[PDB]
Design a protein around this ligand. Sequence first.
Ligand SMILES: Cc1nc2cc(-c3ccccc3)nn2c(-c2cc(F)c3c(c2C)CCCO3)c1[C@H](OC(C)(C)C)C(=O)O
Ligand SMILES: Cc1nc2cc(-c3ccccc3)nn2c(-c2cc(F)c3c(c2C)CCCO3)c1[C@H](OC(C)(C)C)C(=O)O
Lengths: 139, 141
Amino acid sequence: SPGIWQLDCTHLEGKVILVAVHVASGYIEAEVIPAETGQETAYFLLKLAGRWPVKTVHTDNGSNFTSTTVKAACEWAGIKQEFGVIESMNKELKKIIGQVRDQAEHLKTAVQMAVFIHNKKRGYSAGERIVDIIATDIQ
Amino acid sequence: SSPGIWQLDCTHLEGKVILVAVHVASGYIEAEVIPAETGQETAYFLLKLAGRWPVKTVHTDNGSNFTSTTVKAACEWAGIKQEFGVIESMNKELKKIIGQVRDQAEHLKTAVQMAVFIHNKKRKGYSAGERIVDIIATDIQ
Ligand SMILES: Cc1nc2cc(-c3ccccc3)nn2c(-c2cc(F)c3c(c2C)CCCO3)c1[C@H](OC(C)(C)C)C(=O)O
Ligand SMILES: Cc1nc2cc(-c3ccccc3)nn2c(-c2cc(F)c3c(c2C)CCCO3)c1[C@H](OC(C)(C)C)C(=O)O
């Protein structure tokens, strides 16, 4: 479905990366966060929901995802949460980060470079698929 | 007019800087509260924007944070064309929504993200969020 996203956290260089994947397209949004907290997760979801049509979010049962702050943000945004593709995206994003890591001072820059590379990679790219999927659902 | 052209600007609110990006053809907005009006903050914002949407051209004023070599270098890496000098009212509308929802959040960054959500979902046939994907899908063909 065009409104389904998978979310998870991944670790790199003793830092936390919050990753969102649009399941149907492979399009990703990622951010380096100071810690895996409900406040960081809620803020990320609120940004994501204002940018794309977010209908359902699939996560695991980690405390940052089951947090009442997150539940309340989803209730405000009209998002359905479901607990218990993102497994491989973690590896691919980590591969691209490793490839460009020495081109940036900060890990957050390397992460945003990796998101750009991933989403533009073409014969459609993930960035083209997501808008094609969503535009057809609007008819 | 084109699906890859964005207008960027800085606004101030409560002693903080808000960087606002408007997709000119749709009225779609992306905004973030930044700790300081610097080339580094502006470059980082553009890098995130360019990885999320097709960004071909960025129109800004001649502010030092936009004329910065860090921003010029980030645009060069991303293949973005920079151009300097109704979207003047976008800062006013965003500030209007921010003011309406301000007491519903502790942090200004939250109120800004609530305002972006409200603005992009607003129908009064199509919303800005629908128009951006429709304009970009049309040009993909
Ligand atoms: C700290 C820092 N200083 C500087 C300085 C100059 C720079 C480069 C050429 C001429 C003049 C200045 N660029 N530049 C960058 C910079 C900015 C980008 F947008 C970017 C890239 C990088 C390396 C790589 C390609 C993708 O885009 C940074 C990065 O940090 C932030 C993103 C700012 C938080 C960093 O992590 O190194
Ligand atoms: C600090 C803070 N604490 C809390 C606590 C609870 C909360 C709400 C209901 C039950 C249990 C806890 N929510 N909540 C929020 C919160 C989170 C949202 F995603 C959000 C909204 C807000 C108010 C409003 C509607 C839009 O979505 C925040 C906000 O801060 C961050 C975004 C986290 C950085 C804030 O600035 O107030």
